[PDB]
Design a protein around this ligand. Structure first.
Ligand SMILES: Cc1cccc(O)c1
Ligand SMILES: [Cl-]
Ligand SMILES: [Zn+2]
Lengths: 28, 21
């Protein structure tokens, strides 16, 4: 779903911001 | 997953923070 593709792009920028030093894994 | 919680409805940062390391 292209809408999810777009949404996920924003989700990872959000994770980057919130997770900070901790970092994160993105697993769709 | 995060795509299902947070793309069907708008998560908060406290929520998003669950998915961090
Ligand atoms: C910050 C952010 C981006 C995309 C979806 C969300 O629920 C939250
Ligand atoms: Cl978008
Ligand atoms: Zn966008």
């Amino acid at each position: 779903f292209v809408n999810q593709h777009l949404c996920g792009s924003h989700l990872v920028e959000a994770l980057y911001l919130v997770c900070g030093e901790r970092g994160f894994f993105y697993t769709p | 997953g995060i795509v299902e919680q947070c793309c069907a409805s708008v998560c908060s940062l406290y929520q998003l923070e669950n998915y961090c390391n």
